[PDB]
Paper text:
Rabbit muscle pyruvate kinase (WT-RMPK) was the first demonstration of an enzyme that requires monovalent cations for catalysis. Eukarya pyruvate kinases possess glutamate at position 117 (numbering of rabbit muscle enzyme), whereas bacteria have either glutamate or lysine. Those with E117 are K+-dependent, whereas those with K117 are K+-independent. Residues 114–118 form a short loop that connects the A and B domains.
Residue numbers in the entry:
A (entry chain B), B (entry chain A): 12 to 530
C (entry chain D): 11 to 117, 216 to 530
D (entry chain C): 11 to 120, 204 to 530
The structure:
């Protein structure tokens, strides 16, 4: 039985491809999908972070929805300590990226009239007036409810729906006022204090970057974060504002736009054009749109991201049950596998690593499933279709990337080696989805850290000084890649690899491709 | 905005098809994937079952792992009471099938020494003797463990793994003895009394049908069940053995083989050939094989069943969290949607409807997700690949089915109407996956109930007597389907349907196809 | 042993493997789907020669009005009709033959000259089945020909001849206006660089296939056979590749009009057509035609696609189509089954014009309309059974697709059946 | 506003839409990939006419030993070589010309026309005594290839191979398929042969004429599948023996033979004895260029890759990667440094639309490369530089200057360059996207 689902790889049709999937066809060692871990109480100690790295974590995510600057600064310090605890061995060292996830725009209710812990009950068909009057800020009850969104009246019409407490309660706008809305309770429940509010189908005019977000983005520039996950992006202008706040000092920080509501989906193309990558933020997205539609948006977005060559992250509740249990449900294994088959560059753990009981098991399981689904991709068709989608472009590096990936298919190369400094050459190789891993050797540490955003890039930091003879400097980096690959078990002596390098020191991309045996 | 993802339907490639999935494209009313609900304490009252039927239940599953014959007979009687409560209106009556799911062969440990309610701790790296000596049957502990599987020594080698308590505990056979096993605790835990044992990769020679199973199968025959879900099917002989047990009285009862371990997967083709259908029983399957591999087996199995035209069920933990919560996780919505896209004819609920707090919510969510994913199928490609896969067959009924489905694609027919008595004509239409629903009108009540196993067959019982004039009998049955379709909102006057009928009373299949406007 | 009709190649996954599987020992079927159009002139206008030309496979007779008086072509047409009707006693074996008038056209010139107007009116008076309109340059020329044919010739199919650069560049509007197209390669090869003709040919056939409108490939197909009894290798190749391109009909000009070997030329076109028809890649072609027409949801198109699909699946020996305007049969032929289409009609002009469509074998039912709709439908369906058995298309126990109207007022064949041959 | 070289049709999703987009106003490129093979005879064997034949595009000269003495054909070959070398002073513009020997094979003669017996068990030998003498004469004359008439089985090919023996071991054997048995036993014949000719003259008599195209498309397909050269021959422009312009069926035939995938097309009487040999060569050159652009390269590449997917050969990987890159960036050429020819052959099998400039120091490699679609061979006569990189750069720049001189590309255009990394590299393991200097 061939490894890596290669029998299924040879199928003519997608049906026969599916039919040939073999549970006894062992995957390869290398795992191409990036794993993004939300760091929290369960995972922010240095020792646990070392174990997260060993288990497969590639990006550490700090959710600034909560936590002080001091707290997240400590977390980032602990991440970097754990990461550098491995730095003595350049051949085993794994770059770990650092991501800042902004709090973004939020709509919150007031305090329920009473002592605290108090609740009111909303019965279907009842009347509830929403009021912006700060006089009712702490006197919410069954008849009057205050929320912090001063402009809500301008963005809602009669009959539009208002969700409260993460969609648990739904309201329909019956009458509209200047500083109030009169609504009928469509779906009822018990309402507590300071709950989340969502406005499905509305063009929310809250600022793209709030005052807290500006402070947090400047903090992230100060802490040398590799990338920002920007919340509730509804339009390209929101990305532009985030970019302006990051400004010239943070020009190289990768901006990942989070798609979280209907407008972000409807305007997704302009957002994608303006972004460096995308996160499918399925939790809030499933509150804003019918949950049964989320997969449509997920697949659309991953497809379009794959088309543009831009990183896409699938996030939220992928292994939810592992917050409390050491093993995932069958639905969760299926969700991770199908996100990989969809084409997600990275998959994410939220509560599973922030606060749950089994963060390391969660990371390890995402790693195992990811390797299995990577082999099960139908690469020949995927490659043909990606090439068809990008055919209006005649970019020279895409030509080399496509030629190199084709060569890697034809001779079943064990890896592609890419010498890169901005990372773009490796990015363009990853875009055309080879099955073999991409060992990207770079002297730019931030390039290495950001590379985790691209499917299949295993970044290696070259710390050697520049060799005077360009050819010998190239051979140095290629041999670094050979040794890393041998140590990680991706290939051995006598295997075949594709090597992408620059012809001369002034070559602006890897314009040179070779089939080389491993020494 | 085109409905039913028809814009994505027109794409040239799978990538572009995915890129065109649009959350604002509304699905049709008809829902094709069958929903199989496990009935238990949370759902067996007559009134709740009426709600189950209205919310979308097509098959009632009785899990005979537990429950007395009296309990399940009462449950089945309540299912039939609820079902017949709609029978006064033939146009609104919905056939509801009744399925018996056998307990099957099981390996169980002994009682923990003392009360029996005690537990002992199995420490990783510790040693554990498995024993067949009935003296330790009730004196199980941390050092010695008794199993009721007398032949285990015959089917296990040194280095084999033994899982205990639903995979929570893992043992590796270090030394093999005459009536015992010396094992190392690879994965530890607290071992209670009388827990399940699994033997990954082992050819378990327990009987296909246990002593309990024979009694339960005869009980199901007396109860006039439409179908049996036969547990732990490992090979064709097991399906035959079950078929023999069902005998002459149960010759028309459909046998659905549950693939639950490695051997059933490895020997899947012969099992498929011998069965009427297949269940991807992901729970036990994920205990027997690495959970990260279950999706492979799922897609392979669904593909192969789709290839053969035989019903396939996806089962277990699809909406697991809904046992305790009123809405599913995003991983669960993804799981259901991808099961439908895989091509599963039916999706299943177990604890979610048997015992959970939100059974009706689970049914409703499966129904909504199924409709959205059905629209998102890539019908043109699926049809081409199914046809290519079956191209060595020149069967006349397949020819009629493919022509009818092709015509239904071309003119966007609102439905296909198929007059059938054995069901085979409707089965062959459903096999070639039209997007429009299949209204199968039959005088055979059992055919109507069993048709629920096939994607898209909406079965309708004709209770009228046979008309002397064949043409008038045909028109009677066709108008019944038209009236059901209008009442269910599947089409209205002026829409177009495909109608498949027999030319004369002696036609052995629907050899006549028409494109008809809805009156 | 060896599958017939290039069916082994039919099962191929790629076009390359389809080529690699072409087997000179895989026998074609008896039926020949590509229409044969013969220019009649001195070598072929006698009643006896025309009888043998029908028997050899001529389906359409073309009168080239570049030269000749009305009296001369009138007599040619009379002899055509005499030879044709000599077979009319046997309705099972009678073969309808269409009569086509090819206008002289421009020889800054107007689309339709004064001579051309008189000739077109003559064609109306002569009851021609179709007009081949020379040097069509734009849709307006087609509209002129249509107005000149007027109400009396409103049923005369207008086949525009694409003969220069402008006609190619403006081909889409011409095709929209036309009932069909001829790739008139003689003049086209002079008006545009000869080495580009194949591009034009392949483009035009493709677009006509996309539309379901008849396309004729014409001129010098078997040129050397004017003076020689056997074709050159390039000429056999040219006929075969014109069939593979998708031509509904292939044409003979001097080869039958004035050459020494008219019958041999017709027979050679018949043989090559039959072999090339089997060598088509039907699965991909059907998929690509369906893809191209998917914005249409027409009901008869759906019936045609479903019936062609069913005929592929069960390898039906034929599709039997009951039709009066021909449209039902035209829609079936458009989706290119490999099996012959036996179109039974009571409209004689319909039967004659059906030759413009690949695979339509027209059969004129002469019995009177039966009182019961079901019995009249069986009458025409059994007419087709008897024709197919007599012509060697099928025998008892074979499977045929049968397309009929359900009830008397059906506006198309809305009923499809898979039927055993009696 | 109108793409060249049928690039709009190149973007189609289906074969049908690819046909519908074929555009007579889309200009083809200057380079012509299909090799042109000319039979030399009384109408064309003079040194001056042969110069004009080279300039019109003749790539291979064919000596038909059905008639003529050794001395006569020796003189024809001598004149070919004189005409060819008259251009050798300029290595940038020198065009290698291959010499081919076409054996007489079995014949039946009666005034003394040939006789054909379809379906007869002709007892004639595979290789006659005259055939043996002519093959040895070809070895003595340093012919680049042999067209072996009437091969019926692999054993016939093996006989010709043995007769050529060790002294002629590099002479390419092109089996001529011209009767039913050769078609039926084609797979073993292809395996044993270096290439194939579809000898449609004899084939159209030995099998029913209406079946010839079936054989032609089958054979070209299988030869394309194997990467072995296939020639389409006989009566492609027959009417041009006596007329200055071809018939429509003849233009169609040449164009469809290129579309089928034939590496070469041939002229026999049209150049051997006809009144318009130069015109026949020029007509094939023009039609080839138009049909070459009209190929459906994307589907063709997918299907060739699919049929060869069981191979993981490294040079195949380089060729497929280089051709894929040449499609993506619309490169004007692929430059291939080769000595045996194998690397360039492997590129040619995967059918780029851009021309393949094969730079070699092996003169016979250069002459034989004309059997492969798109290989424009260039003879490097410079001495070997001491530094490998400098020698590679020297040959690559020779190719640059050739492409600039021939109008294939200009400064600032993009080319794919296939070279060996080190002198002992056994194939072109190095690919670059390079700007033209
Ligand atoms: O905001 C998020 O991260 C989400 O909802 O997934
Ligand atoms: O039996 C089942 O349903 C299972 O294990 O999934
Ligand atoms: O008129 C014609 O038939 C032509 O020019 O080919
Ligand atoms: O020998 C040949 O070239 C032929 O037969 O065509
Ligand atoms: Mg959010
Ligand atoms: Mg189970
Ligand atoms: Mg003309
Ligand atoms: Mg010969």
């Amino acid at each position: 039985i061939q490894t890596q689902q290669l029998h299924a790889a040879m199928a003519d049709t997608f049906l026969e491809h599916m039919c040939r999937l073999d549970i006894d066809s062992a995957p390869i060692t290398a795992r191409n999908t990036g794993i993004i871990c939300t760091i929290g109480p369960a995972s922010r100690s240095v020792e646990t972070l070392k174990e997260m790295i060993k288990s497969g974590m590639n990006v550490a995510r700090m959710n600034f929805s909560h936590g002080t600057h001091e707290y997240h600064a400590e977390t980032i310090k602990n991440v970097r300590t754990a990461t550098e605890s491995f730095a003595s061995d350049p051949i085993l060292y794994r770059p770990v990226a650092v991501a800042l996830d902004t709090k973004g725009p939020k709509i919150r209710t007031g305090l329920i009239k009473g002592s605290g812990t108090a609740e009111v009950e909303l019965k279907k068909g009842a009347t509830l007036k929403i009021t912006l009057d700060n006089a009712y800020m702490e006197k919410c009850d069954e008849n009057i409810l205050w929320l912090d969104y001063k402009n809500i009246c301008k963005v809602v019409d009669v009959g539009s729906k208002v969700y409260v407490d993460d969609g648990l309660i739904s309201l329909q706008v019956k009458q509209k006022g200047p500083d109030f809305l009169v609504t009928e309770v469509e779906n009822g429940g018990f309402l507590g204090s300071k709950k989340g509010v969502n406005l499905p189908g509305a063009a929310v005019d809250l600022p793209a970057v709030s005052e807290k977000d500006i402070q947090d983005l400047k903090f992230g520039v100060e802490q040398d974060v590799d990338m920002v996950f920007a919340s509730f992006i509804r339009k390209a202008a929101d990305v532009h504002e985030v970019r302006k706040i990051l400004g010239e000092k943070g020009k190289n920080i990768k901006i990942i736009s989070k798609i979280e509501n209907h407008e972000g989906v409807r305007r997704f193309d302009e957002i994608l054009e303006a972004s460096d990558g995308i996160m499918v933020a399925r939790g809030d997205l499933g509150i804003e749109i019918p949950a049964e539609k989320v997969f449509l948006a997920q697949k659309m977005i991953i497809g379009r991201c794959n088309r543009a060559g831009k990183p896409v992250i699938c996030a939220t509740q992928m292994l939810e049950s592992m917050i409390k249990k050491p093993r995932p449900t069958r639905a969760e294994g299926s969700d991770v596998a199908n996100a990989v088959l969809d084409g997600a560059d990275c998959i994410m753990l939220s509560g599973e690593t922030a606060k749950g009981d089994y963060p390391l098991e969660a990371v390890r399981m995402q790693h195992l499933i990811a390797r299995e689904a990577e082999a099960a991709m139908f690469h020949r068709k995927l490659f043909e279709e990606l090439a068809r989608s990008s055919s209006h472009s005649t970019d020279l590096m895409e030509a080399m990337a496509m030629g190199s990936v084709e060569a890697s298919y034809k001779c079943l190369a064990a890896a592609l080696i890419v010498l890169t400094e901005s990372g773009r050459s490796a990015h363009q190789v990853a875009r055309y989805r080879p099955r073999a891993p991409i060992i990207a050797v770079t002297r730019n540490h931030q390039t290495a850290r950001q590379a985790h955003l691209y499917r299949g890039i295993f970044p290696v930091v070259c710390k050697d000084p520049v060799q005077e003879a360009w050819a010998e400097d190239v051979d140095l980096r290629v041999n670094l890649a050979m040794n890393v690959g041998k140590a990680r078990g991706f290939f051995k002596k006598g295997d075949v690899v594709i090597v992408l390098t620059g012809w001369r020191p002034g070559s602006g991309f890897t314009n040179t491709m070779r089939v080389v045996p491993v020494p």
